[PDB]
Design an enzyme around this catalytic site. Structure first.
Site, PDB file in Angstrom:
ATOM      1  CG  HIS A  17     -34.841  98.862-113.713  1.00 54.26           C
ATOM      2  ND1 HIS A  17     -33.984  98.927-114.795  1.00 54.26           N
ATOM      3  CD2 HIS A  17     -34.068  98.560-112.642  1.00 54.26           C
ATOM      4  CE1 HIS A  17     -32.748  98.691-114.385  1.00 54.26           C
ATOM      5  NE2 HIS A  17     -32.776  98.437-113.087  1.00 54.26           N
ATOM      6  CG  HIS A  38     -31.714 101.385-109.441  1.00 56.00           C
ATOM      7  ND1 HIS A  38     -30.556 101.682-110.128  1.00 56.00           N
ATOM      8  CD2 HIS A  38     -32.039 100.116-109.785  1.00 56.00           C
ATOM      9  CE1 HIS A  38     -30.199 100.636-110.853  1.00 56.00           C
ATOM     10  NE2 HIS A  38     -31.082  99.674-110.665  1.00 56.00           N
ATOM     11  CD  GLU A  39     -34.764  98.003-108.340  1.00 57.99           C
ATOM     12  OE1 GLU A  39     -33.633  97.800-107.862  1.00 57.99           O
ATOM     13  OE2 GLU A  39     -35.089  97.566-109.467  1.00 57.99           O
ATOM     14  CG  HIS A  95     -28.523  98.679-114.879  1.00 53.84           C
ATOM     15  ND1 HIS A  95     -28.232  97.363-114.607  1.00 53.84           N
ATOM     16  CD2 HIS A  95     -29.466  99.048-113.978  1.00 53.84           C
ATOM     17  CE1 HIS A  95     -28.959  96.953-113.582  1.00 53.84           C
ATOM     18  NE2 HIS A  95     -29.718  97.958-113.182  1.00 53.84           N
TER      19      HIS A  95
END
Ligand SMILES: NC(=O)[C@H](CCC(=O)O)NC(=O)[C@H](CCC(=O)O)NC(=O)[C@@H](CC(=O)NO)Cc1cc(-c2ccc(-c3cccc(Cl)c3)cc2)no1
Ligand SMILES: [Ca+2]
Ligand SMILES: [Ca+2]
Ligand SMILES: [Ca+2]
Ligand SMILES: [Zn+2]
Ligand SMILES: [Zn+2]
Length: 159
Positions: A118, A114-115, A124
């Site tokens: 980014h 997930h990170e 998101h």
């Protein structure tokens, strides 16, 4: 439509290691998380121990030097900056969580996928099956796969 790395060779460095897991397991989780994204893009990731990495992986606590203070155990688990120089790209994990290789505590691999999303420029997703959805959820890590929405997102940024 967020920022992107203007190159396809990206380096990362693990600044420090959580005591929750052994070093080899942290290395493995982070390497596998990068691999998830390299599998569907032209991006390549190399770990370095010295030099100037693009993406710095950090475990830290509370107020830790940026405008995104952590909140102790629970709540926010990690955060990351989009592509850019310096702190850009960097991924920070809240040491007040209990990081694991498994379903207990907070799974480092899944959170790192997930990170890193980014760190590569994704925001998101509103799709509840996407790894870029805002809330953490443990799934079988040996059967984990990026959702079609995540693949759409990252392929729209690179390639
Ligand atoms: N509310 C919760 O269920 C947990 C509880 C935490 C606790 O108390 O231990 N907390 C969070 O999920 C927090 C909420 C923060 C808030 O909004 O207040 N979320 C995070 O800390 C995010 C923050 C963030 O967005 N950073 O960039 C971090 C995060 C997101 C995930 C991620 C991983 C896999 C999946 C997933 C979902 C479906 C399928 C699949 Cl394969 C994977 C989608 C999200 N991993 O780390
Ligand atoms: Ca950086
Ligand atoms: Ca927290
Ligand atoms: Ca910890
Ligand atoms: Zn931070
Ligand atoms: Zn996020």
């Amino acid at each position: 439509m967020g920022p992107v790395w203007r190159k396809h060779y990206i380096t990362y460095r693990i600044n420090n290691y959580t005591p929750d897991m052994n070093r080899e397991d942290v290395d493995y989780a982070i390497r596998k998380a990068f691999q998830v994204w390299s599998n569907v893009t032209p991006l390549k990731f190399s770990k370095i121990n010295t030099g100037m990495a693009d993406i710095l992986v950090v475990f830290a606590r509370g107020a830790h030097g940026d405008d995104h203070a952590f909140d102790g155990k629970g709540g926010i688990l990690a955060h990351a900056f989009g592509p850019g120089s310096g702190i850009g790209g960097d991924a920070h994990f809240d040491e007040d969580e209990f990081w694991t290789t498994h379903s207990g505590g907070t799974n480092l691999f899944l959170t790192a996928v997930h990170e890193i999303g980014h760190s590569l420029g994704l925001g998101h997703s509103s799709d509840p099956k996407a790894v870029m959805f805002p809330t953490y959820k443990y799934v079988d890590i040996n059967t984990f796969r990026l959702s079609a929405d995540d693949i759409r997102g990252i392929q729209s940024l690179y390639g």
